[model samples]
Target: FEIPDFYVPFPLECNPHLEEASRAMWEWIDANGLAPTERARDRMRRTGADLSGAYVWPRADLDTLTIGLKWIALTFRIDDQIRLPARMTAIDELRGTLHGLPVSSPTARALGALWQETALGRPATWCDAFIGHFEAFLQTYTTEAGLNLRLDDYLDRRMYSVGMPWLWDLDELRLPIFLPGSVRTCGPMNKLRRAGALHIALVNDVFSVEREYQHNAVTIIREAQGCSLQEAVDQVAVLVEAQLHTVLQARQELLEELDRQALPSRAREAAVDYAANVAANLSGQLVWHSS
Candidate 1:
């Protein structure tokens, strides 16, 4: 299953702390008793979560990036290990314990840690918004599991399941910055966010199609369009390029808004920085898969 060329316009950056942070991340995982007793390194290598957290948000400090990377690894582990639809109760407990409400599981324990540290020294607004997106993704993700979904239904679920809403929140935390609630909710910013999510999902589907057992763009499009595997892949390629245009156009509009509003130059820069990170995430994930 060959991956078609991607139109990646963003510059990709790698953090210098990759080696040190990874060792520390593993140590942190062990300290929390989160690593599996068997084949732990293999799983880490297979998931590529370690590299993802490091490279995707290179601008973040090592301490923050390690935490962020750990977050990704844990989420991917839970998603991979749990049979979500059948174990809905576990999902509830996980969320509960994530904020001190209540899990008996290792993943559950990690959640408490993820939050305990995450909320420290951060603004309430950022943490609140992050939880909102984070919890909804869990809800949407679990709901769609084990179901045969139509193309539109799949796309809607993929929006959250791809984990962009929370990942963007994570990206924001990577910097010592937060967008004003007003900036994030405005029209163009919303557009940029959605386009960025769609772009990531589409690109991800193509790369994972070969080893992917679950639904992705290629899988859904294959059956829905009644096309051959090759044709389905080409179809997604077309959609990928289309979404790239939307992402670029949205960024342009966002910049225009900042100019017209005459917001602080800082506001303008933070907004741009957010968009840049979004783009880096897109390319960085592809590179992770490629490696």
Candidate 2:
């Protein structure tokens, strides 16, 4: 397995309050029983660094940003379970608990708290969008593993299972406002979102190639191109760079549209911030994973 080279223009920045954020997130995990066993707790503590969440929302206040980081940590804890019947069952338990079933697993218990906190005081539509994407990711993930797929088909499915759409829904909460359908679906904005999502997907594939090989897991570049680990990583690096270019291009066009439209100042600002957040997500994740 090999690691590939990739470049990002955004400077790597992280919240100075990262230590406190990690402490708070760990406290939340402990209180919620998200890490029940000693080994589980240790792994969670090791991986749930403050930097990943801190960088993702650099401008947010400590309390608000820390809470969001807890969600990210909890998400990593849950995603770590993606291996077998347990993975699918944990997702089902989360879906059930979110919709009114009793929580049974640690993953469900933790996520139940996250879902409640995330959805509280939000529009029903917003909650639906997040939950829908969550459910879709689990379903797609269950279907994606253990099956042969072409690179094209694999990339499409991997985007959803990578959980970008569900994660992006947090922008609504972080921005503390609802994005208008017009702005969300507009040409440049849509492209920005897709490009960011695609960048995330490819980069994850690139960085995780070695781990995936160790697990005997299938990957899009590996299977699609029928290549070695190094070759697959190289191919995905190209895709990641291409998608990042799309993100930059779409962001520029969106900024122009934001200025051109006669939108309210609040809406205009939110739209601009949304695009910036999308870029932050890509740049932050690149730094986080690369490190």
Candidate 3:
């Protein structure tokens, strides 16, 4: 299928220690039995977990960078089983482990380690914010796997449950800044986050058509509109562009509000940095898919 040219302004950046991150991540996956065999191991590496589109920001120190790499690897591991019943069990197990319960599975242990490391010295609210979104997404995964959802319904749930927002929460860890709950919970902020998520979903939908088009949710567009696959692809691309516009617009409004309210320098800066990071993520995603 032909795909349209998609462009965003931000430059793509990969972790400087990509090889080191990949090797370390691979070892962690092996040790935890997340990838039990050499073939599975190779697939995990080849999937470019090391080159994650959002790996481009916050430029922390080596230890922090390695943690980010490991986190991405963990996400990749969980994502591979997102449609499985075992994934639900794994998520529940992780939740229990986070609350000081025991877990036998290596996967749960591995995730527990990440959670502990990520939670260290951070605000309890921040930890809960991340985990809450994380668990909600997992629950959505379980629900969607067993349900026959219409396009609008699926997209609405998928936009939130796909885990990008939780991933975005990592920005705070990487940047070492606390975005206030007021800003985070505000309508404009939700608009910005939702716009980015929708843009990502549409982008993934269009690009994966060759591999996933048969069962892809975007097929709803085709079925409902009586359009061909190519037409559906184009429509989704249009939808992605629309969301990108919304993201940019919402970002501007957020910045202006921050200024109008004369929020503290740190708060204003945090808002600015987040907007840029979201743009970077959007651009980097397109780059990752194209490459």
The lDDT of model 2 is 0.72
Reference-based TM-score of each model: 0.92, 0.85, 0.89
lDDT tens digits, residue span 119-164, model 3: 8898888888787777776667566655633777777876766567
List, residue by residue over 1-291, the lDDT tens digit for candidate 2. Answer: 556566778665666778787788878877877777898767766664567677667766677677777777777777666654655665577668768677637677767767777778888877787787778777775665545256666666666777777777765776757877678778998788778887887777666665553222236556656777676666667788889899999989998877777778888888888677778777788678656
In terms of TM-score, the best-performing candidate is 1
Q: Could you give candidate 1's per-residue lDDT for residues 89-168 as a string of tens digits? A: 76687768756785547778788878888878989888887887788778765676546347777777777878888877
Ranking by lDDT: 1, 3, 2
Write down the TM-score for model 3.
Answer: 0.89
- Relative to the unseen true structure, what is the C-alpha lDDT of residue 227 in candidate 2, on a scale of 0 to 100? 78
lDDT of each: 0.77, 0.72, 0.73
Q: Candidate 3 overall Cα lDDT vs. reference?
A: 0.73
Off by over 4 Å in 1: 83-85, 146-148
* lDDT score at residue 145, model 3, on the 0-100 scale: 59
Rank list by TM-score: 1, 3, 2
* Location of the lowest summed lDDT over 10 successive residues in candidate 2: 212-221
